[PDB]
Amino acid sequence: TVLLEVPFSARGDRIPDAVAELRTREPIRKVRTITGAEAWLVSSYALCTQVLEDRRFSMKETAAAGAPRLNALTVPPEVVNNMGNIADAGLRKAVMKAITPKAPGLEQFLRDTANSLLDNLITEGAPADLRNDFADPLATALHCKVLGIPQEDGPKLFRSLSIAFMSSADPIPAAKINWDRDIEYMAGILENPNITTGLMGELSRLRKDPAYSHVSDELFATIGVTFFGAGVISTGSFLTTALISLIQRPQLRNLLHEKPELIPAGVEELLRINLSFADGLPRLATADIQVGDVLVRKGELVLVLLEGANFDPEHFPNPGSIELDRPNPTSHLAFGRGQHFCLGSALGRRHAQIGIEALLKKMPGVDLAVPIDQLVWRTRFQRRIPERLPVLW
Amino acid sequence: TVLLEVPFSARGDRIPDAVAELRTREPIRKVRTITGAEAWLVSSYALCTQVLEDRRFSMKETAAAGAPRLNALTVPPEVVNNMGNIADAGLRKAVMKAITPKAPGLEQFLRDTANSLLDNLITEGAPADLRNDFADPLATALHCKVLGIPQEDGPKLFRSLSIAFMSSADPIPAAKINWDRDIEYMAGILENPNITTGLMGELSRLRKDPAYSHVSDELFATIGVTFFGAGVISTGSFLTTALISLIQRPQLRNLLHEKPELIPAGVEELLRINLSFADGLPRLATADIQVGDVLVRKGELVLVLLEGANFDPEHFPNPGSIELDRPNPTSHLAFGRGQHFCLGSALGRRHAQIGIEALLKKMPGVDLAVPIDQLVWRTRFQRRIPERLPVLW
Numbered sequence: 001t002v003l004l005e006v007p008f009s010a011r012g013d014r015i016p017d018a019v020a021e022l023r024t025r026e027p028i029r030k031v032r033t034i035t036g037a038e039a040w041l042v043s044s045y046a047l048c049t050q051v052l053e054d055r056r057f058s059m060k061e062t063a064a065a066g067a068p069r070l071n072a073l074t075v076p077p078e079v080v081n082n083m084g085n086i087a088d089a090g091l092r093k094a095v096m097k098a099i100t101p102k103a104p105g106l107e108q109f110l111r112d113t114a115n116s117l118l119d120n121l122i123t124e125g126a127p128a129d130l131r132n133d134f135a136d137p138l139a140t141a142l143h144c145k146v147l148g149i150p151q152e153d154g155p156k157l158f159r160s161l162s163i164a165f166m167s168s169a170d171p172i173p174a175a176k177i178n179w180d181r182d183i184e185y186m187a188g189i190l191e192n193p194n195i196t197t198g199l200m201g202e203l204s205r206l207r208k209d210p211a212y213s214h215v216s217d218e219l220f221a222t223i224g225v226t227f228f229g230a231g232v233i234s235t236g237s238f239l240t241t242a243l244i245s246l247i248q249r250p251q252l253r254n255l256l257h258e259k260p261e262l263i264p265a266g267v268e269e270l271l272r273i274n275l276s277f278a279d280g281l282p283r284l285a286t287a288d289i290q291v292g293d294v295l296v297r298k299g300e301l302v303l304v305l306l307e308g309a310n311f312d313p314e315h316f317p318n319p320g321s322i323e324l325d326r327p328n329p330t331s332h333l334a335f336g337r338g339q340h341f342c343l344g345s346a347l348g349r350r351h352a353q354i355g356i357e358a359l360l361k362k363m364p365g366v367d368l369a370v371p372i373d374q375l376v377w378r379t380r381f382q383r384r385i386p387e388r389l390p391v392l393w
Numbered sequence: 394t395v396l397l398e399v400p401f402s403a404r405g406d407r408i409p410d411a412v413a414e415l416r417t418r419e420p421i422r423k424v425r426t427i428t429g430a431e432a433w434l435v436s437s438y439a440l441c442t443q444v445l446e447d448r449r450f451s452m453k454e455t456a457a458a459g460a461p462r463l464n465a466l467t468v469p470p471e472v473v474n475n476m477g478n479i480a481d482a483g484l485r486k487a488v489m490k491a492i493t494p495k496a497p498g499l500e501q502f503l504r505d506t507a508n509s510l511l512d513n514l515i516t517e518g519a520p521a522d523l524r525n526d527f528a529d530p531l532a533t534a535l536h537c538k539v540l541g542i543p544q545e546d547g548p549k550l551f552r553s554l555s556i557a558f559m560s561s562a563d564p565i566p567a568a569k570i571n572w573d574r575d576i577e578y579m580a581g582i583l584e585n586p587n588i589t590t591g592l593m594g595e596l597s598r599l600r601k602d603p604a605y606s607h608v609s610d611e612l613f614a615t616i617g618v619t620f621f622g623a624g625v626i627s628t629g630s631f632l633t634t635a636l637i638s639l640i641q642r643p644q645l646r647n648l649l650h651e652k653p654e655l656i657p658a659g660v661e662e663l664l665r666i667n668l669s670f671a672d673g674l675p676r677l678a679t680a681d682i683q684v685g686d687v688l689v690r691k692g693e694l695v696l697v698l699l700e701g702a703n704f705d706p707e708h709f710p711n712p713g714s715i716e717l718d719r720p721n722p723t724s725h726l727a728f729g730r731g732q733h734f735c736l737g738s739a740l741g742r743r744h745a746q747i748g749i750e751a752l753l754k755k756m757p758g759v760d761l762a763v764p765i766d767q768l769v770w771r772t773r774f775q776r777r778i779p780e781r782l783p784v785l786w
């Protein structure tokens with residue numbers, strides 16, 4: 001038999017029984033990635049947190065030439081250290097401030113957008129596709145507003161993402177074509193005097209402030225492309241698979257419909273059980289480091305399996321059940337942990353909360369319109385998502 | 394180990410090594426379908442032809458209540474015998490005449506449509522998706538013209554197909570919703586005095602002719618829905634995967650570009666090697682019948698594996714190679730054989746020939762824009778297709 005291959009399944013509606021067997025038997029174990037590289041797959045809550053909280057397991061060094069790879073780069077190697085670059089340019093606080101859901105008018109914009117999308121689906125009649133015609137457009141609209149860019153520019157930027165977020169053994173020529181185009185777009189945005197709000201409006205101002213005169217135009221454009229992509233793919237994908245989890249729990253659907261004040265707790269549990277990340281989070285060891293029964297050697301690749309942590313019964317008893325009264329509800333790793341904890345966590349929560357609130361109000365009878373096994377799961381991608389999500393109501 | 398399950402792979406770019414091993418060892422053998430039923434999978438050219446040419450292996454009887462099933466019905470059971478119903482209504486010759494590619498102006502329409510689609514892709518710039526933005530729209534436009542219906546009605550009818558042609562273990566609620574809507578649409582077309590050309594224009598006339606006064610309005614509408622769906626899914630899917638086969642053979646691409654008069658021979662070979670049909674063709678035995686070393690019993694399900702026949706080296710030496718000078722070039726089973734031989738075979742050939750001619754003229758440098766393994770193959774569907782086909786040129 002060959003060395004255990006990752007990822008195990010592209011299906012995002014259920015966790016393989018094998019994850020629990022692996023966590024019990026070998027919570028750090030050797031695997032082969034799609035590139036043919038070896039890696040250590042970490043699958044218990046304790047060991048996942050250990051790796052994520054130890055910066056000697058480096059994100060930046062995953063981009064080093066000659067390293068064992070999970071998958072091919074789809075961005076320039078310097079862009080793997082995007083947040084480090086942002087910090088070094090003195091831009092971290094400004095970026096963080098631009099991406100909070102608390103910005104005036106933003107939540108009402110989200111609600112208005114969700115409700116319009118849903119009204120259009122109701123007008124057209126069932127079946128509706130909740131990914132392509134709800135969750136993804138909601139994510140796209142949100143991120144255009146957050147960035148300060150025209151809504152009509154969203155679709156073309158969105159269309160890069162089915163390739164930009166591939167998880168490929170080999171470099172992807174289309175990724176570079178789209179990256180270079182999208183960078184040119186963001187560079188134009190920075191020069192556009194009409195763009196005065198949101199993240200790009202703020203970066204535009206900082207660009208002309210003496211305190212940032214030696215920050216490169218490349219970095220400013222890169223922030224725009226990377227935040228649009230990461231935010232849109234992450235929120236669209238999470239909301240889509242959260243909707244599946246909800247639709248398959250009619251009792252929970254009914255409870256949240258009846259008591260919408262429980263939606264934040266529900267969304268936190270949907271985050272905990274979410275299978276949106278298709279691969280473990282990669283890190284490269286910069287030292288020899290003991291992780292459980294394994295001495296990881298300098299230069300080795302480590303993969304932090306989020307669902308390994310999040311379904312660990314030692315930390316989350318009855319891990320497969322959505323319980324709205326857990327004593328440790330935000331202690332999941334859906335947003336990572338440590339140095340690279342998700343900058344967009346509050347925005348991600350709000351997108352999902354508002355999307356779900358709107359859907360339950362407009363479509364309280366929502367149900368799948370096809371048997372669950374008929375969903376088509378995207379392969380060799382950094383997220384798990386159904387290509388279409390057909391529903392009726 | 395469990396009984397061998399079908400289908401073997403949803404990948405449409407390569408035949409599994411296992412097909413040849415099976416044909417050699419056990420050219421009729423027992424398998425389990427997605428419903429849990431047992432079936433006989435037939436995989437040699439000799440045995441596939443035998444089954445297809447013996448009407449005691451019945452298409453109609455596959456719809457019988459209580460039969461072992463390949464997959465769930467997505468149409469009313471009477472619609473499985475659509476061609477029998479057409480014949481009995483005296484409509485077979487008229488339907489055949491309406492779907493030939495030789496109709497005045499049709500081939501020029503195909504060429505004009507292909508060229509417009511391609512010009513739009515060139516204007517937008519690489520990468521382009523040759524399935525969603527070329528092959529499928531070309532198929533849809535063709536079938537609206539063939540039916541005599543407005544081009545602007547094509548997209549909505551097309552959108553039914555990702556569900557109508559599912560290969561599901563269980564009935565699909567959305568299939569019935571879309572079927573009933575599409576039937577209402579075709580019924581309206583038959584009543585619409587503006588619709589005077591194509592298949593629906595002819596059926597409209599025959600409907601009011603005394604020789605067809607006791608043919609049901611249900612049958613007339615059913616012909617419209619079934620011919621649109623079967624034709625669009627079959628041509629769109631075939632052309633898409635033929636384009637992959639061509640793109641992966643730069644020499645052949647160059648030869649057909651240089652000598653376009655060889656395109657018909659090329660398309661015949663692309664048909665022969667095509668993996669578009671995801672499942673064997675189902676038949677139910679109506680008698681005990683010897684097939685190779687197996688006595689198939691009355692009531693048993695038989696699956697005719699088209700690629701089993703078409704890659705059989707006993708009939709097609711060097712079966713995986715496209716050879717434009719074979720002595721038996723149309724003797725493949727891409728269009729079936731016998732009673733249920735494809736009514737649209739000439740139209741299917743023309744769609745593909747014209748699409749390929751246009752693509753090679755406009756995009757002689759066409760190549761995949763992503764590694765081939767990055768294509769996402771649709772699962773649990775009656776065809777094998779990539780969800781997107783990214784190319785550059």
Ligand code: HEM
Nearest residue numbers: 083230231234235238281334335336340342343344347348
């Ligand atoms: C529910 C939605 C989201 C989920 C589940 C999610 C998940 C994650 C995870 C797991 C990480 C850690 C990656 C690692 O440590 O290797 C991360 C980091 C990150 N997230 Fe999110 N994310 C979401 C939404 C967003 C949004 C809306 C944005 C911005 C608009 C965003 C921007 C980022 C960025 C820029 C990082 C990199 C942090 C770093 O490398 O230091 N995310 N996210």
Ligand code: HEM
Nearest residue numbers: 476623624627628631674727728729733735736737740741
């Ligand atoms: C390259 C394109 C096509 C391919 C590969 C294809 C393939 C096939 C195959 C394999 C069968 C036999 C099914 C069986 O025996 O169980 C068939 C039958 C059929 N085809 Fe096609 N087809 C194509 C295009 C079309 C088009 C354009 C139309 C109509 C516009 C069409 C209409 C039909 C119909 C109505 C049948 C049923 C015949 C019967 O049950 O007696 N097909 N096709």
